[PDB]
Amino acid sequence: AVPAPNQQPEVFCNQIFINNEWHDAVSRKTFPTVNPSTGEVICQVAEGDKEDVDKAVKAARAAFQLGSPWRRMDASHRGRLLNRLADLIERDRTYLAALETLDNGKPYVISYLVDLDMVLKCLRYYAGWADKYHGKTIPIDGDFFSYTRHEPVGVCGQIIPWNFPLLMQAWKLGPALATGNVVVMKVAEQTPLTALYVANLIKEAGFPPGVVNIVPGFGPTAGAAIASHEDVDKVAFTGSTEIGRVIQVAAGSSNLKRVTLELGGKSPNIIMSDADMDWAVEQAHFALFFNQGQCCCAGSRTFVQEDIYDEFVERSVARAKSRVVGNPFDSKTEQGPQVDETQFKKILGYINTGKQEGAKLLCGGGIAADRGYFIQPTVFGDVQDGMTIAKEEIFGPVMQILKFKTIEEVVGRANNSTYGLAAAVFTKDLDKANYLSQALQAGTVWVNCYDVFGAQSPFGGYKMSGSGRELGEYGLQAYTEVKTVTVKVPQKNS
Amino acid sequence: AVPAPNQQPEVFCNQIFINNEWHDAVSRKTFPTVNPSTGEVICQVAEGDKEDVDKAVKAARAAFQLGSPWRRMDASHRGRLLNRLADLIERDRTYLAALETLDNGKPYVISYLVDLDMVLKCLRYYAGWADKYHGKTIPIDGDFFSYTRHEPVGVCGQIIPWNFPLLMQAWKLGPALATGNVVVMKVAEQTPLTALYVANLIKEAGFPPGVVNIVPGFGPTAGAAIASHEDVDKVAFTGSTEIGRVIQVAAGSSNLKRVTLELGGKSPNIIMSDADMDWAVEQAHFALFFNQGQCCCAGSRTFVQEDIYDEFVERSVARAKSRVVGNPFDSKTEQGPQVDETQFKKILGYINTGKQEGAKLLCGGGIAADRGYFIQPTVFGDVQDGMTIAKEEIFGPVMQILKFKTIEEVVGRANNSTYGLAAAVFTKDLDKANYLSQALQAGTVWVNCYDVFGAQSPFGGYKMSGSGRELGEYGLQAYTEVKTVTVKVPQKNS
Amino acid sequence: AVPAPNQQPEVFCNQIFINNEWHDAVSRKTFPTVNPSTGEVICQVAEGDKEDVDKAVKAARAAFQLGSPWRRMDASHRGRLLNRLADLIERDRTYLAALETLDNGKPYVISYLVDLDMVLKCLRYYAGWADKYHGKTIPIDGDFFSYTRHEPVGVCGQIIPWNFPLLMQAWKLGPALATGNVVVMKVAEQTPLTALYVANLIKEAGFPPGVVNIVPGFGPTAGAAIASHEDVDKVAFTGSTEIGRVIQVAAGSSNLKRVTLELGGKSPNIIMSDADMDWAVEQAHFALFFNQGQCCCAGSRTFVQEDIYDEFVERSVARAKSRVVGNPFDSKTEQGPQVDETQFKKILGYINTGKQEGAKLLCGGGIAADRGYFIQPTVFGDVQDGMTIAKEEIFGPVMQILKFKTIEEVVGRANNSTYGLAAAVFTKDLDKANYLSQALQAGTVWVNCYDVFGAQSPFGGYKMSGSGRELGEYGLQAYTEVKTVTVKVPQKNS
Amino acid sequence: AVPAPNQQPEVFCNQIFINNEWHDAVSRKTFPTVNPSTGEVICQVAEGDKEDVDKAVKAARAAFQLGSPWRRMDASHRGRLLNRLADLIERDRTYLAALETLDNGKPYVISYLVDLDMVLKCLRYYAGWADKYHGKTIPIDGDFFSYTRHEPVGVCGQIIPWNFPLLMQAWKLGPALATGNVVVMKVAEQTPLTALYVANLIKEAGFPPGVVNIVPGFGPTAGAAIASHEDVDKVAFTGSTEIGRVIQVAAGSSNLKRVTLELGGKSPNIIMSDADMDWAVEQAHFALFFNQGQCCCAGSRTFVQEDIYDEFVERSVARAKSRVVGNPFDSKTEQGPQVDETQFKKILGYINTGKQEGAKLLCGGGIAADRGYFIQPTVFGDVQDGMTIAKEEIFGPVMQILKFKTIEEVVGRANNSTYGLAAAVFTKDLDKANYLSQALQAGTVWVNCYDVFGAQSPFGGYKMSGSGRELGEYGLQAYTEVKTVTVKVPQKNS
Ligand SMILES: Cc1cc(Br)c2c(c1)C(=O)C(=O)N2
Ligand code: NA
């Protein structure tokens, strides 16, 4: 049930999107976006900078003015546009999945069945919320009638990463638009193409001009410009924990814009001795190697109870050596290339530190192909908490397996981190599952599964893995500004 | 029915409160707190600094450890302890009101009937939330059971101002303690005493050691230490917008602690021509002069429709000329002194700027007594949007009256501001009231009333008046960390 | 924008709908359904009875068995099917409007622009609710993890009236299907055809067999059979109060199935002396004469303050005289015929009694045509509370205009009724609106409008106008069975 | 820590409680209430009938009038009153516990530590809800502002049973008074004394006259008069399924008042082979024998997996034989007498039935003393589904143990019942716990525990065990009438 891909899809949108129009950058500068499987340039893209962001923000501010089409629009009709957008994305599903693989590197099978399926589900879910996020009527003391209005927060700056271009765009636009906000979105320079085509679909669906504006560009230029703009009411950022800090400083430095962050992780995958061996091994493989390890909540610390450690290691090693690496448009390929040169080198550098500090390399370790940013599935064994590969986010196909004895021990070790994005627990015991799910300091805890996302269930970080939540009802909170209206009445009665 | 005050209440607590015990500062250094009615010193207070804050955060962290009495305590019993603390405050109500007046300057009548009443109601409102802030069970796709846990955010740094010492303390501790957080509080140097006595009642109530820790001191020292601490999970700040920017920068530069801000305003009070004149005059007077003008949401821009301007102004002047300034322990006193020398001078400087930039001085405008920080009820007329007194927060008993013609005009002028804490509309017309409360960009809009606060009704700013909300159900949101638990199940059914 | 009607639409569906297939009655009996504009039979329809209801319930029970396609289906996919059903209704919108007008008699323009629009909005609203009606996780005392599942109530019997055949069908299916129930629906003998056609669309949309079953037939046989059935879990009935009482008794004397009722009314439309006159007149006309007066919430007691009574009356009578009565497919027609001969007679009898008892007949009064059940727009002035036409629900184009003096008077006079479905207040004054909206004992109070329905806002009776609510989040409550799960854990922590 | 009881406690209240005053019946009639431990009369109590109920309903209705102290009272203050009542009950705990034991028969240790504790927790829980049950503001289509008020349902009839007299009174009063309703309560003739004393405390707490009225008397007279009353808006009833039918019929037959029902059950307690045997045996014993087996959700069907059956039965019989039956005031006593002679005889009837239909009597099965109504702890083994003792509620100390093999089997057999109040599952396996908790058709499913109640977690029946839920937020739903107010506005914006 996967239709055939077009392995060289035409590029139709490569410009700045403001007011449902396509614009070259003010400076006329451009930048190349690259095909990571070949390393060849796909096409040139307009390089937005502050001046282009200023244009986007003004366009958005005007679309948001009291009495505008977007503000007067019925809430139900915002839901109707979101469903229309989703129908258009479904019409062009194969195209977009192929364009995603071309620009990102992830396998086309995964793009089609996972990424675009989740885009469609996210947009259709939030379509449903548009007219259901009620304010409150409140039994305040005295002769008063008091109630809340859930207004849009306003102009929302949204900076999205390269690991899931399409899906992250959906994750941001969905809540924003459902609650009647306007956006200025900065797409990642590595993967700008799918998001710009979606902008063309946003025009086709019938969204008023300026409601969604997209400005491709670099982090320190366009990203920073959105972060520090005096008329952006809210910023939402998914990227490194390092940059997250820069984003929050920029907001305090600028106009006290509201901030939410979805950052990195070093997520513990915990395998108890009573776990289903086969299922655990396959899921822990998935937990780490999914999307070429380019996953903020990748199970990068696989904790295994000592009684089953040896069997688990041998099975994991066998599975990693069997994982097919190659052309992402091949239906047999399970792992495509990494996204770019920088990440390629970064990963190879982290593998070097693993070997340097005495972690046992059990398979892979090196480059997987002569052409493109391909890296062999790599497993380290006998990993220690103090090792660099056990502490820092690698964001590549590099597995760390650790040994533990007691449940008290692994809790302490799992939680001993400045990250807390996700975690997982594999066990057949009811009490162990509940004890561990409670104790783990993680935004999402999976029990006998991994990477189970639904648009209905919130996702986000504890500690320095981020603040605020995306998905679910919770994802609407940061896109709402609460107004209390309190009216004197002649006589208050229950 | 007000009980006669003790006009010289004994001071019992004046040190640093950590682990239900009283500590001198590591440096052993103290600072004076002044009785603003006299300019004389009440007592010395321990000057807390970074190292004292570090001790408090350690005490908070230990009390928040999994397995501790506080973490294991039933949600319902947390409510009982909050209800117990409320009873203890009510028990000592006459004393606390007197001490509030002693150290802050506000009238004893107001301290007793307004301040302590709202303290009691806040604590009792939040006691009710302890066991009712439910997470969710979520109908996710696939064979999964998914639900959310609403956990405490953890160690909460709380910085409160000097204008409502006891009430601002209750606003912070209520929602923090109801949701099982631990607290490191920084009280203002000008008004530390009442907060510190409440610490004794917190211990007497039965709160475990370290759950509430209070460290008096300066803003640049103790305040900056909390906002920048590596192991504080959350900071809530109330104060000026200037300082709010520094807090958010400090959060971003340290450990990405979650931030909420309650800041200043320049709130518009809009009087339509069909307003009840006598009610509007009295309420607009209260809106501005309440608490010696020292209200973030003070009605400092009194917009009056041109048809009723002259009459409104005459009536407003007569009310201001009759306002009794004097000893706050005298039952006839409406207005006590300003809080300290800095504010006394600051307000006088603004008064000077008002008559210098062409605003019409109608009454007052000078010092009201030769001892203490008493300022005359001052009223400016013919105030224009360009004037400093129309733009900046004076935080004193200084009234600005501006004239307007149409409803379209006043919406534009009222919203043209970087502040947006509150606003008011006075009108008998249904459509006018809905038109305005809708169009005004403010966290709270009062209709035919002003300064009506209820624990059930959220409060907080638009724009640079803040982020987040206190009071109501909304107050618990910033003190909760959300954890999704997603469990594989044999077969999901509806 | 209304496309040209096929004025004699073909009837495709006229049987019993069970397991996505069409069935003759077990007895083979059929009954005629009439075109009320002519008095002639459109076609014969299968007369469902106890035996047929027994088969429909067994099919419903089978489709509801644990592990069935319907039970295992993702909540989000239930929503997709509802939106698909809506698209299919929208596809066949012109046909459905014409068929609705043929069987019911309402003008085709109203049928197209109002009834089908509201059908579409209702279904799309509840599609959104399918995967959002969360249960809770509950901070219970002791070492336990407690939560609630919101499960479907089960086999739902749904009995709909004839005044809004398609809309009332949507009002019932929307919430029931969103929450994953199964339905045995009984449609009105006077108007079964459109509901049976929608059953074809239900099959086409993709709903599993047995999820929706429809049994056209008589009230005392097919209706009572559902209401008394030992394996039906929940009954929703919309119709007369008298039969409402029969339904609640039948639930009680069988299996204690859950009951919700949408019953009649004698709703007060209150015109204060300060209302907009032209608006009030047109809304009062609308309030009463919409759908040939066949609305449960019709403004059948129009209270007009004495200072504006004469003008209001003259204008209302002038409006009633110019109201165009005739063939509902003609574009000039504002008022169609009544639904059948019994209503035709009943309404005329109420008109007789109005003249007798001393209400001034101001216009109309009799039969409007020698063909079909057309009644003249009729107005009664100087109506007093004790009059039969002031007490009892006429359900026809017969207006009652009553005079009052004070606000205290009208509240008490309005509330002195065994009914309480809706009310309306027409005024420009803020306090009069708030005073009246609070004091009126009605499920919906409209302020400066009438018959304003939204899928998002709940609708239902006080007193004997019904119990429970439909539409909004509230309309899901009656279709949910709450399950508590409480699980022993090792150690509960916040 | 249990204070020594007064074994012959004085009676202070034995009359009808209307308008905070004590009244004899209009007929001056009284009835004796019996001490089930001795079979001797305690005292006479006023016998309320139709005329007394009518007086009570008029007092309730008067207290509910617009502008009354109770309607005008701040929501937060209702909260305060409930908290005061709880403190007064706690003050008089020893007495109330002793009185409860004297009249009902249950162990004094249990009354004091369990019943009274739960009464305090229920009332304090609902105190917290008084000012937090918000209506909604709703984004409806068009130029309208729409919102819901949550008003009180009105005059609420409350009919409570004799098995938990104090607790059941709290479960009714809490949610009703929290939401501002007024109450006419009928207490059980077997156990009216503790409720009447609490009425004194309700007066002392400061609840306005008429808010709570109590009419002691008999079911067919006083009870029926409440259910049939034309000015009662709602009836909540707890008792037998049979009488529940009578109440629903009466409600439909009169004024369509709203009905919730809490009825009997035949709850399955499922013991899987991997259960903790020691824990499972003690919990199953507690599940059945608690409160002399007079619990609606008693684990009256103990399903034990075949591999552990013989050992479980052996241990269960030994535990039954060791249960101490005696004077409920004696600290050694585990089991008191049944409540009265009617239940005494009925239980002996059921025991006889078990023997006659082939159930194997393992211990007890007879009368345990010559005085009072004491029955031997009785255990039947090898019970089959088609047996009457396996089907019908015995409401005595009679245990049914059934054998099963497969998890799929036990689901069907557990669900093959017209009841569904509760169920439990004992297992160490996560997947079995989730599979059963989902598959069991019951309002509460306990996992590895039984009879775990929390004021926070709802309770109620599936099928014929009741409808509606008490406790938690859900307990408020039945005490709320929802009013939609939809207001036309000049220009709707988001
Ligand atoms: C933000 C985000 C989204 C998705 Br889908 C993910 C991740 C992170 C992962 O780490 C993963 O495996 N899938
Ligand atoms: Na690329």
Ligand code: NA
């Ligand atoms: Na003094």
Ligand code: NA
């Ligand atoms: Na007809």
Ligand code: NA
């Ligand atoms: Na008794």
